[PDB]
Ligand binder design. Structure first.
Ligand SMILES: *[C@@H]1O[C@H](CO)[C@@H](O[C@@H]2O[C@H](CO)[C@@H](O[C@@H]3O[C@H](CO[C@H]4O[C@H](CO)[C@@H](O)[C@H](O[C@H]5O[C@H](CO)[C@@H](O)[C@H](O)[C@@H]5O)[C@@H]4O)[C@@H](O)[C@H](O[C@H]4O[C@H](CO)[C@@H](O)[C@H](O)[C@@H]4O[C@H]4O[C@H](CO)[C@@H](O)[C@H](O)[C@@H]4O)[C@@H]3O)[C@H](O)[C@H]2NC(C)=O)[C@H](O)[C@H]1NC(C)=O
Ligand SMILES: *[C@@H]1O[C@H](CO)[C@@H](O[C@@H]2O[C@H](CO)[C@@H](O[C@@H]3O[C@H](CO[C@H]4O[C@H](CO)[C@@H](O)[C@H](O[C@H]5O[C@H](CO)[C@@H](O)[C@H](O)[C@@H]5O)[C@@H]4O)[C@@H](O)[C@H](O[C@H]4O[C@H](CO)[C@@H](O)[C@H](O)[C@@H]4O[C@H]4O[C@H](CO)[C@@H](O)[C@H](O)[C@@H]4O)[C@@H]3O)[C@H](O)[C@H]2NC(C)=O)[C@H](O)[C@H]1NC(C)=O
Ligand SMILES: *[C@@H]1O[C@H](CO)[C@@H](O[C@@H]2O[C@H](CO)[C@@H](O[C@@H]3O[C@H](CO)[C@@H](O)[C@H](O[C@H]4O[C@H](CO)[C@@H](O)[C@H](O)[C@@H]4O)[C@@H]3O)[C@H](O)[C@H]2NC(C)=O)[C@H](O)[C@H]1NC(C)=O
Ligand SMILES: *[C@@H]1O[C@H](CO)[C@@H](O[C@@H]2O[C@H](CO)[C@@H](O[C@@H]3O[C@H](CO)[C@@H](O)[C@H](O)[C@@H]3O)[C@H](O)[C@H]2NC(C)=O)[C@H](O)[C@H]1NC(C)=O
Ligand SMILES: *[C@@H]1O[C@H](CO)[C@@H](O)[C@H](O)[C@H]1NC(C)=O
Lengths: 591, 590, 595
């Protein structure tokens, strides 16, 4: 009596579950045949216009220190770095200990090395030219006698092939199908709480995979009041991600003209060393307009003193250790950079223009968690400049307690992983099922978004939304990205690239759960009607979920998304009752 | 009308041989966070919940099961899965090095040092090492030139084994992609090819424990209540017959000495592991076995020898020389290989009238193996610190009939060695892959309980039971199929390994196209469920002319397509055109 | 007669030109399976013998020769097939060392050599007995008796795995379901023209995936006279080709007995060179009768006249360079040939404006070949012991223009070589690929026994083409398992080494592009609501602004291929505006259903 069971195929309630993302690009504005080691010649053309609807009443917590998109792309970029390294040739025989003298200049930085090597198998020997500097050469047995690479005693070094470019491209991570992506718009979300002003979106936004440490550049601005985030403070063994509103923009350059000379080793082997030099050489200085840097720190200390009992807070430079960890390591214009940040944190303040960062460049790049493999870049000819907006910092607080009640800050840096978190804090993946379970007691203006929040009604419009979200679940051209008819004719690409793993992965996923819904409904009730009541039977013998309809007319689908996790037996027993009700009727017309 | 009103039928135990590829199935019992230190398996990534299967006991039927398709798939899979491990593993780059080998205190021919005089790959320095070595690993000249070198150097390259990985088996379960079935013969008293009397079916296999075994069958499965040997060609002396055992035979083996481990640096990412040093006692590894049980057991087996095949005399000569592997008994346990001179087992001779202490065997260890069908593949193992004690159940013996003259001695059964192919044949001896076409056609005379159910009777309603079979296919949540809940999540992050999931996605993508491939005919015929889909076609008796009785109760439906469903294919087209010329007349004229 | 509802159609046999991944077919694997080594170079699925090819001699649209699709896509295929077989083979790396060579005497083509070789660990051989041809060495100096490998600047070091042979297998390309291959039963129109008699074909006829220079082997024939294929600025300067009307054939010789000596190199590697020669050597030579050459070559003049009025002709020899297209290039016997055509084109024809009836060819062979489109990696070819006799048919040649004015009333046709692309671009000329858009839109009709195949109603009778739609479904885009799953489950699963060849990854790509289409078309049929039927009518008045045509022109004699280009402009309109009008009655339908 009263049936108490309906599937309600039109219900927008989610499951907090990871999946595999879907990759995308926007190379339709560029189409450069140089392949841009991230972009790898144009993933898929982006959408012309994405859509969002604010979902005002949902207030879900998002621990951004538990987001799987952090770790999932963490393997992806390394693998993208791993793949595009692989075909290009490696410096295996070039590991010989070498003599090396400095250049005529400063302070004896640049060093011209000479060395024997049997490059070819044609038995070659010659004192070959090689130009370096003191950041890649370790000395052996004395400061002045012997010289060798700081790596290749242990690691593996490889010359990346010069054709591809180190220019980060604004991409879109995007979800394949069915399951979607959430967005936190209200400000001051420190990363451990709930958030408000929440909308959803299919592809994220223009994400830029930048890699430099000790600062954050070309990231977002969040043009409001300043906010700073960290997983923890009292656990002082954590780190602080700083975010900044005011777009500080810093220009940097290489102060000299350079050429490209190659060492022709053997088959397919043309080692590109530092060719030559014309002019004088500087330390590639960076000027900041310090009055902004004098300014914006005073913004920070106000929004930090409050979090630690209006108490003394100061800045000290970081300690010793590793060049990737304490030095401002930097990459723009393709070529890498190190910069001494001591002129920025010599600043201890407690409440009442031009600059020179003597910078360095770095060629061979080790891993960040291993000792195994190391990547090498060729020198780029001529001069180069780079100017970019800088937004947000990376800071830690030292754990030792002093006898003043003050806090020493030393700048964080040394991880790939949390660098991407700053672009991901607004976002959360969620898994979508249109499935539902809700008893019926009743008779037996457009929202594009995937939520309507008024779960007190099933039926005023809460049925009508996923009707429109079913229109997502089938799409060909410009609705669904993958089933776009033009690119499928275009895509005769091999799958051995990380693309062809990730590309069809989404497509085989998209089809199967589309059929997975389709089978599981079709054996149990066809979707010709959205509400499945052929007097499908009542459940109050073991459901017993004590409620009446008018309090279901004032509720959310909150308990409704946690009835049949305790009682999924109810879901299964309607299947056999579907099986039991059909096994008597059809064979009755048979015999 | 008694005119043949054709009608489709969805749900019928239609069989055919097929050659498909399968998924794995196991438990998180011995998981312990090793899908990488385990073996090739990756701990068998998907999950077997529960062997909820139902067998069938209706009919006897010919199957000739010794000619199957699982066996050669397993030959490709495991060797590939062996390749999967060693591909990130390093390569021994100095191979045919000088190796000044000697050892102090002359048991002789024991473990020796060999003193590398090598150059590293990075620098240009020449250095000296110590390295412990068995006798079975080197090849000298003249016994005093110290010309010992690694045996498989001139064959091919030799790798190390990425020493963090173990070597135990795990009982796995081959599960077919659904829409299929797996058949098995368990009516007792049965051997090899020919018919059986049991139509018992399963969805997944039992716990195959795939150890690559030598001469004896090692903790696989025991036989039935009676010792039986499987059916082969008893002529031709080249079928290498194998007999199972009713009882189990138990043997434990152990190296008495304990050993340490060193690490020798070679080059970039090349720290090579060898035996460090030995503590005190240097006794050889032996293997003891109660001969009184062994004296008993062979008495049983020669009874089944003479009576089933030539009852006169039998001489167990040992196998003669040749292969270093086929002669001795190369046992694996503890993640460790060792060979065994089993000559102290077959010095027996048997007759009928004149018939009716725990022997120990000296075994010995080799550090190098080789591919058996190929010269191109060779492997190491890391020396395991300390001591290893592990036992084993013996489950069967591999036999070879020889001889050209017999009046002196009628039977020469030398202990047969393996091919590596037959070890699966020892365990896949009763299985067969069967595709199902659930659709089928037969006349109607009206126009317009287990997993297979009755292979003999009529279908009152048992087709409907075949539908829940046919629609579990991509449930996604329902736990019998593969449950697709942890089964999705275990692979969706790590499909990038591409050794086992490439089966699984191909298992996926085959399952869906057999779904739609069965749907497309249903979609075109407009049946779309309803399980019977009556039409109105008067069909000629050009094919079958029998009365309404015997077509309908006296005969079955597996035989039905064999007996007169012949050069048809056009019967499909006849019901195809009928519906279109119906609906066009129904819609744009009526 | 003015209800004028639109009607959905599924299976109107239309097509558009597209690009698609390919899919093999070779049922000769079931015929002969000698070894799995040519099959390692050429692994393929077996299909149904006796397919159904249906002739539709009404539609005669233009066939884009010289811009055709498949010439591109298979070209990059075969390089990867050659790359796939080469990668696990060894790389003869340290043999770039200089080679002290002496002359074997009993010309001076073949030469014995000796050099230093460092092995695996430690052994040094003084005089390795290495035997070499003339045309694989370079003098470091002219008076120097030391010689070096020619292309050893780059990766010459690859040598083939010697258990593998190199013999062509009749292969057939297939597109997956939803697609079709076309073929021109019109008798030898031109290069680039619309031809009348055409047909459908699922998978093409036998192809020998071979390579040749100024020559074509085992191709097709002309049922008519000799025909040619060309284009516009070919008449300015670009290579044209030759298709002879009937096959002439040569039988081309071997030297003698050969011996396959192995040379130890290192750990997992062993180089193979010619050990020993039994007897004295005759050069390899081909036999061909000049009378067969004489009779056909005047027909070439008849064709050069059927083009350039009746002007006379001179065949000077090809060029003064390019050692790869100055001679011939065969692969039979697992061996690469070169034959000087100097003795062949001592020809010039009559001004119409006999000794030794058979002719021999002084020929040579090289052990080392090299790719051309990129300077780089190169293959060594192993010696073949025994006898290397060979014979094949000649069916075609390739020719240049030689633009210019010298005598002002003559022309030179020095024979054309070419790239690798032309050899297929020759014999793929009848063939082109289309897709199917089986969804159809045409307005309603006012009124409320012979076999055809794939496109059997698409030729003509377009109102009557509305009958029999499902033959355009059942096997054509339905029946995914037709040759994609039917007979391949064993043998192309039986030992595919490393499980991912170039064919299977296409085949993986093949099966999904079927169902992505098939679900995706069903997706729209999901959205369109009229699903579970074949045709259906919605409730929207077709405005005459789309087509003010009289209804008899539609349902009797106007082609669906030009019907669609008339509706083409308003396609994105109807697709949107009718499903929302469907959604307009649907949002009232739940208002009728729920409320
Ligand atoms: C964070 O984001 C910021 C913001 O995007 C990045 O900073 C940008 O970095 C990009 C590249 O990294 C800069 O674009 C490059 O600028 C080069 C310098 O151009 C200036 O000088 C030239 C000559 O004096 C002027 O003509 C330029 O004026 C033009 O560009 C400006 C800026 O858009 C326009 O406003 C003007 O109207 C002009 O259109 C600039 O004043 C520039 O050389 C370079 O262009 C070459 O490279 C591109 C591909 O990169 C080629 O397609 C193109 O053909 C050029 O190639 C020629 O020159 C090179 C030079 O070596 C030769 O090698 C070639 O052979 C060929 O001759 C490109 O436009 C951009 O200016 C800069 N902007 C700012 C505000 O910083 C940061 O890099 C980024 N960092 C991180 C960590 O994310
Ligand atoms: C255009 O198309 C046509 C057809 O469409 C092509 O014609 C083909 O041309 C090739 C090349 O000539 C032929 O294949 C090769 O033939 C070689 C000659 O074989 C004959 O001589 C040898 C030596 O005396 C005999 O042994 C042969 O007889 C044996 O084989 C035939 C046929 O199988 C049987 O009937 C006999 O009973 C014998 O069994 C012939 O008389 C031949 O040497 C060569 O063969 C080997 O390679 C395969 C693996 O690839 C081995 O399995 C096989 O056993 C042979 O291997 C031996 O020889 C090699 C040589 O080095 C050694 O390395 C091995 O270790 C082993 O000792 C191959 O068969 C082909 O027959 C012919 N087909 C037709 C229909 O004419 C044109 O080539 C083609 N042209 C172009 C440009 O594409
Ligand atoms: C141009 O298209 C037309 C169709 O529009 C096409 O016509 C077909 O031509 C062939 C060849 O003349 C005909 O086929 C013959 O049919 C008879 C039976 O009626 C068979 O006996 C013949 O078989 C013999 O000859 C075959 C070789 O042609 C042998 O293979 C065979 O073993 C037998 O010896 C043969 O099949 C066919 O009937 C006509 N079709 C019609 C409609 O008339 C013509 O082929 C097309 N031309 C091009 C170049 O494709
Ligand atoms: C190929 O296409 C042609 C035309 O595209 C088809 O021929 C046409 O067939 C129709 C139907 O048979 C003919 O209409 C009838 O013609 C007869 C003869 O005059 C007449 O008596 C009838 O009253 C009716 O009008 C039509 O005339 C004819 N036209 C032409 C140009 O042939 C042909 O059937 C198609 N065949 C194949 C194999 O594709
Ligand atoms: C310039 O370099 C040369 C050669 O190394 C050296 O002898 C000389 O002292 C240098 N001079 C200056 C001004 O640095």
């Amino acid at each position: 009596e009263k049936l108490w069971v309906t599937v309600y195929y039109g219900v927008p309630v989610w499951k907090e579950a990871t999946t595999t993302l879907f990759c995308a690009s926007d190379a339709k504005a560029y189409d450069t045949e140089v392949h841009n080691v991230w972009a790898t010649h144009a993933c898929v053309p982006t959408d012309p216009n994405p859509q969002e609807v604010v979902l005002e009443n949902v207030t879900e917590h998002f621990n951004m220190w538990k987001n799987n998109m952090v770790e999932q792309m963490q393997e992806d970029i390394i693998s993208l770095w791993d793949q595009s390294l692989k075909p290009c040739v490696k410096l295996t025989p070039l590991c010989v200990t070498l003599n090396c003298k400095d250049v005529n200049a400063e302070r004896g930085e640049i060093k011209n090395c000479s060395f024997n090597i049997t490059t070819s198998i044609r038995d070659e020997v010659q004192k070959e030219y090689a130009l370096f500097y003191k950041l890649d050469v370790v000395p052996i047995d004395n400061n002045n006698t012997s010289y060798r690479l700081i790596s290749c005693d242990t690691s593996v070094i490889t010359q990346a092939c010069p054709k591809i470019s180190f220019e980060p491209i604004p991409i879109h991570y995007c979800a394949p199908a069915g399951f979607a992506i959430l967005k936190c718009n209200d400000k001051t979300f420190n990363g451990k709480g709930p958030c408000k002003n929440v909308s959803t979106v299919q592809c994220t936004h223009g994400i830029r995979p930048v890699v430099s440490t000790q600062l954050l550049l070309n990231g977002s601005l969040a043009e409001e009041e300043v906010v700073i985030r960290s997983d923890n403070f009292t656990n002082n063994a954590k780190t602080i991600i700083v975010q900044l509103k005011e777009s500080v923009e810093i220009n940097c350059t290489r102060p000299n003209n350079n050429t490209r000379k190659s060492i022709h080793i053997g088959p397919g082997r043309a080692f590109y060393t530092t060719g030559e030099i014309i002019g004088d050489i500087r330390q590639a200085h960076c000027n900041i307009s310090r009055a902004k840097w004098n300014d914006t720190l005073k913004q920070i200390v106000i929004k930090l003193r409050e979090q630690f009992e209006n108490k003394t807070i100061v800045f000290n430079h970081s300690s010793g250790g590793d060049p990737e960890i304490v030095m401002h390591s930097f990459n723009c214009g393709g070529e890498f950079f190190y910069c001494n940040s001591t002129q920025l944190f010599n600043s201890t303040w407690n409440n009442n223009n031009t600059i020179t960062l003597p910078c360095r460049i770095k060629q061979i790049i080790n891993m960040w968690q291993e000792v195994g493999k190391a990547m090498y870049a060729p020198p780029i000819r001529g001069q180069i400049r780079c100017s970019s907006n800088i937004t947000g910092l990376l800071l830690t607080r030292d754990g030792g307690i002093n006898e003043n009640g003050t806090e020493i800050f030393r700048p964080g840096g040394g991880d790939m992983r949390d660098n991407w978190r700053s672009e991901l804090y607004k976002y959360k993946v969620v898994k979508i099922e249109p499935l539902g379970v809700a008893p019926t007691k009743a008779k037996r203006a457009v929202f594009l978004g995937f939520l309507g929040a008024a779960g007190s009604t099933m039926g005023a419009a809460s049925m009508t939304l996923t009707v429109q979200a079913r229109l997502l679940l089938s799409g060909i051209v410009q609705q669904q990205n993958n089933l776009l008819r033009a690119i499928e004719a275009q895509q005769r690409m091999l799958q051995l690239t990380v693309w062809g793993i990730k590309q069809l992965q989404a497509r085989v996923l998209a089809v199967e759960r589309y059929l997975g819904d389709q089978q599981l409904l079709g054996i149990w009730g066809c979707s010709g009607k959205l509400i499945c009541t052929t007097a499908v039977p009542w459940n109050a013998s073991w459901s017993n979920k004590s409620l009446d309809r008018i309090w279901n007319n004032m509720t959310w689908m909150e308990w409704e998304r946690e009835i049949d996790n305790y009682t999924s037996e109810i879901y299964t027993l309607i299947e056999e009752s579907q099986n039991q009700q059909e096994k008597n009727e059809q064979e009755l017309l048979e015999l």
